[PDB]
Structure 1
Amino acid sequence: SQEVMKNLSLNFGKALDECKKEMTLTDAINEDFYNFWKEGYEIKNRETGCAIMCLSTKLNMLDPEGNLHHGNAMEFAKKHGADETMAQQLIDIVHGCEKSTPANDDKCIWTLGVATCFKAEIHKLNWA
């Protein structure tokens, strides 16, 4: 289902401008979020990584552990209209990159990769 998925990404990217002012993030992340659904775009602004992570915080997707509130991530999905196997898929992929995807200590870099693997799955699922 793409219909709801647009709403998820939409309502995810609400608090972005707050995070921009907070963390000094450039306008160049609008571009990533606008062109994210291209057929061979590659995401190399580390700031989009950190913007995503700030949005994830603001949408309350972090447990006390910092290992993703997969619990609340599923609420977000069903809250926006998501199917069951859908909401499970987004967690299984996300949970399935939060550690599998290597990065440095750089949590911006980290979350950038977690989004970038996950993106490709959304393409395979034809959710774009």
Structure 2
Amino acid sequence: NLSLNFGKALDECKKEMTLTDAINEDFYNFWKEGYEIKNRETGCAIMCLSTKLNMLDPEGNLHHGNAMEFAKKHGADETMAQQLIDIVHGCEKSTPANDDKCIWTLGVATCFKAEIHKLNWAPSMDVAVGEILAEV
């Protein structure tokens, strides 16, 4: 469980987007089964971690719009990775518009989590999170 490291990145995000401590546990639990988190700062956390990919991948394969090698190393080939990517894009289209980008992003991640659940293969949280963070 949890091959990507978000610890330091989350810390930096809390100071840069002036976020309370609630995000140190909320970012993680956001992804657990049957958990619906409706807090904006979880949105902000996601948006801000998609800006620090270079700190999350211990092997340095996680980059924006360019994550196939990371995917591969986390149980998913290219067609599998690509389907996660298409769900992020379809989610970025279907989520209602919003000037608060933290809120919109929480929307997208919310929509993403529900769609990837419908996949007959079961993505690790690492490759699921990695892929949305890489397309956001």
TM-score, normalization by structure 1: 0.70
- Superposed CA offset, 1:69-118 (max 9, x none): 97325455346553212210121011111121113211101110110011
Flag structure 1 segments of 5+ consecutive residues without an equivalent: 1-6
Which shifted more, 31-40 or 72-81? 72-81
Percent same amino acid among aligned pairs?
Answer: 99
Aligned length: 122
- Bigger helix share: 1
Q: Matched residues in 1 for 2:61 and 2:103: separation?
A: 16
Q: Matched residues in 2 for 1:77 and 1:107: separation?
A: 26
What SS does the aligned partner of 2:92 have?
coil
Cα RMSD after superposing both structures: 5.6
Q: Is the 8 A contact 1:103 1:110 kept in 2?
A: yes
Q: Is the 8 A contact 1:16 1:55 kept in 2?
A: yes
Which shifted more, 75-84 or 59-68? 59-68
TM-score, normalization by structure 2: 0.66
Residues 77 and 28 of structure 1, relative CA distance in 2, 3 Å threshold: same
